[PDB]
């Protein structure tokens, strides 16, 4: 089962969404692509060795999304990002149910489209968000508030 990426979707979110559509573990996707543990590293936003051309093309062969498009699920060259905290604009999620790579940019604190501060934890119960690959439903894993409803609590 193939999936079309959402605009701005992060690599972690896309990988997990592909895995859910195919009932794959991270190790299973890694074996399908021939790169093993690299998949789980990318899902946790760990790129001490940056994704190589061969690794991106290996994943591209499985998910049928070109390496160039996969690179747009990561920050451009020179744009620093953070693996933690995982962040969210609930108003964005209501429009398109994905985590955006921009929300991990170190320079980003406000959603430009919605002119709201982005969230660094659930505004109802304060639970931090899991890595985007594990965003199985669109709700806080603790209190079960929908990400879309968190828009109403954004400041
Ligand atoms: Zn937004
Ligand atoms: Zn919560």
Nearest-angstrom CA–CA distance, 99 and 101: 7
Task: Provide the resolution (angstroms).
Answer: 1.3
| C-beta of residue 114 within 8 angstroms of C-beta of residue 90 | no
User: E strand or H helix at 111, and its extent?
Assistant: strand 110-111
Residue given tokens 């398109």 in the structure block: 96
DSSP state for residue 98 in the 8-state scheme: S
User: E strand or H helix at 17, and its extent?
Assistant: helix 11-22
- Distances 121 to 6, 44, 103, 113, 137 between C-alpha atoms, Å: 22, 17, 12, 20, 16
| C-beta of residue 90 within 8 angstroms of C-beta of residue 117 | no
Structure method: X-ray
Proportion of the chain in helix, strand, coil states, percent, rounded to 5:
40, 10, 55
Nearest-angstrom CA–CA distance, 61 and 22: 15
| C-beta of residue 89 within 8 angstroms of C-beta of residue 111 | yes
Query: What is the number of the ligand closest to the CA of 151?
Result: 1
Calculate how far, in angstroms, residue 18's C-alpha sits from the geometric centre of ligand 2: 25
Query: What is the number of the ligand closest to the CA of 110?
Result: 1
User: E strand or H helix at 116, and its extent?
Assistant: strand 116-117
Q: For the chain, list the domains and their CATH numbers.
A: 11-71 (1.10.260)
Residue given tokens 């965003």 in the structure block: 135
Residue 117: strand pairing partners: 110
As given in the structure block, the two tokens for residue 88 are 């969210």
Calculate how far, in angstroms, residue 107's C-alpha sits from the geometric centre of ligand 2: 25
Residues with Cβ within 8 Å of residue 137, at least 6 apart in sequence:
none
Nearest-angstrom CA–CA distance, 97 and 104: 16
Integer distance in angstroms from the first to the last C-alpha of the chain?
38
DSSP state for residue 81 in the 8-state scheme: B
Calculate how far, in angstroms, residue 70's C-alpha sits from the geometric centre of ligand 2: 30
Nearest-angstrom CA–CA distance, 31 and 124: 39
Nearest-angstrom CA–CA distance, 24 and 102: 26
Cα–Cα nearest to 60, from 134, 2, 17, 99: 2
Calculate how far, in angstroms, residue 130's C-alpha sits from the geometric centre of ligand 2: 12
Calculate how far, in angstroms, residue 127's C-alpha sits from the geometric centre of ligand 2: 5
């Amino acid at each position: 089962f193939l999936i079309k990426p959402y605009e701005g979707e992060s690599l972690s979110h896309f990988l997990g969404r592909f895995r859910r559509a195919n009932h794959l573990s991270a190790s299973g996707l890694g074996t399908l692509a021939g790169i093993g543990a690299i998949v789980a590293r990318w899902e946790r936003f760990h790129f001490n060795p940056r994704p190589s051309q061969q690794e991106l093309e290996a994943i591209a062969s499985v998910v049928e999304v070109d390496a160039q498009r996969l690179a747009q699920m990561l920050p451009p060259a020179g744009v620093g990002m953070q693996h933690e905290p995982i962040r969210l604009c609930g108003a964005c999620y209501a429009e398109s149910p994905c985590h955006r790579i921009e929300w991990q940019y170190k320079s980003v604190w406000k959603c430009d489209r919605h002119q709201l501060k982005i969230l660094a934890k659930c505004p109802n119960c304060q639970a931090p968000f899991k890595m985007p690959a594990l965003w199985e439903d669109g709700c806080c894993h603790r209190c079960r508030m929908p990400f879309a409803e968190m828009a109403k609590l954004q400041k």
